[PDB]
Amino acid sequence: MRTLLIRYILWRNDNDQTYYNDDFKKLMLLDELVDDGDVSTLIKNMRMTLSDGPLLDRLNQPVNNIEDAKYMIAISAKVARDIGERSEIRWEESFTILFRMIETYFDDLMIDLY
Amino acid sequence: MRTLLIRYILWRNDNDQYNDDFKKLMLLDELVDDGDVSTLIKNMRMTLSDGPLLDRLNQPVNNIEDAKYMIAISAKVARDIGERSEIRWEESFTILFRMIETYFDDLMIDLY
């Protein structure tokens, strides 16, 4: 699940068809869980501060259920999409936090998605 | 370069499936002796951890050739450890990129 998620988020950032996988379609359905106004706000702040800081702060918030985890995947995905490929983000730091929160739900997320 | 490298190492581990980019990166494999990888894999298995890999990656990088080796050692370990291996790859990337980040520009030039 770790690999698939790293791959999906990076793909959401550059949208390189060379690195596309069919398991991304199911993950993309989680986008409905995130309001675009929240993303707009988050992106604006990232740009305001010239950092991944605001993203990392959002990812550092508690995950108490699978729906919380699904949201975190989707917020990462939409931020990755909207921030642009030129964006010099140390993605591994975001993955560190994301997986620290969602890791436990991997098995159940695998079930819920496939 | 960060993205390409994350993609290459993960691909080396398990085959997602193809571009020219990975071909150039694969040429760096000659820099790493397979006996060193065999040893590293053996230790990882002995300890049931990425610990030995992380220890290798935490060693100093003083030139581009040092950086090229680190990419290749990561690649061959990724290959030889197997897909089933529950490795927190992001921790390896954290250390790898902490060492090699400065060389990204020159590595981009040297490879393409």
Author numbering:
A (entry chain C): 1 to 114
B (entry chain D): 1 to 17, 20 to 114
What does the paper say about this structure?
VACV protein N1 is an intracellular virulence factor that is expressed early during infection and modulates innate immunity by at least two strategies: preventing apoptosis and inhibiting NF-κB activation. N1 is a Bcl-2-like protein that contains a surface groove similar to those in cellular anti-apoptotic Bcl-2 proteins that bind the BH3 motif of pro-apoptotic Bcl-2 members. The VACV Bcl-2-like proteins N1, B14 and A52 all form dimers via a common surface comprising alpha helices 1 and 6 (the ‘1–6 face’). Biochemical and structural analysis of these mutants demonstrates that the anti-apoptotic activity of N1 relies on a hydrophobic groove on the surface of the protein and that the anti-NF-κB activity requires an intact dimer interface.
By analogy with VACV proteins A52 and B14, which have the surface groove filled by bulky amino acid residues and do not inhibit apoptosis, we introduced the bulky residue tyrosine at positions R58, Q61 and R71 in an attempt to ‘fill’ the N1 groove and thereby exclude BH3-peptide binding. To determine if the point mutations introduced in N1 generated unanticipated structural changes, R58Y, Q61Y and R71Y N1 were expressed in bacteria, purified to homogeneity and their structures determined at 3.0–3.1 Å resolution. All three mutants crystallized in the same space group as wild-type N1 and the overall structures of all three closely resembled the wild-type protein (0.21–0.39 Å r.m.s. deviation over 108 Cα atoms). However, in the R71Y mutant, the tyrosine lay along the bottom of the groove, not protruding upwards like the original arginine side chain and so the groove remained “open”. In contrast, a R71Y mutation placed the tyrosine flat on the base of the groove. While WT N1 and the groove-filling mutants (R58Y, Q61Y, R71Y) were all dimeric, the I6E mutant was almost exclusively monomeric. Introduction of the groove-filling mutations R58Y and Q61Y abolished the ability of N1 to prevent apoptosis, while mutants R71Y and I6E inhibited STS-induced apoptosis as strongly as WT N1. Interestingly, groove mutant R71Y which retains the ability to prevent STS-mediated apoptosis, associated with Bad. Consistent with this, WT N1 and mutant I6E and R71Y all retain an open surface groove, bind Bid and Bad, and inhibit apoptosis. However, infection with vN1.R58Y or vN1.R71Y induced lesions that were indistinguishable from vN1.WT.
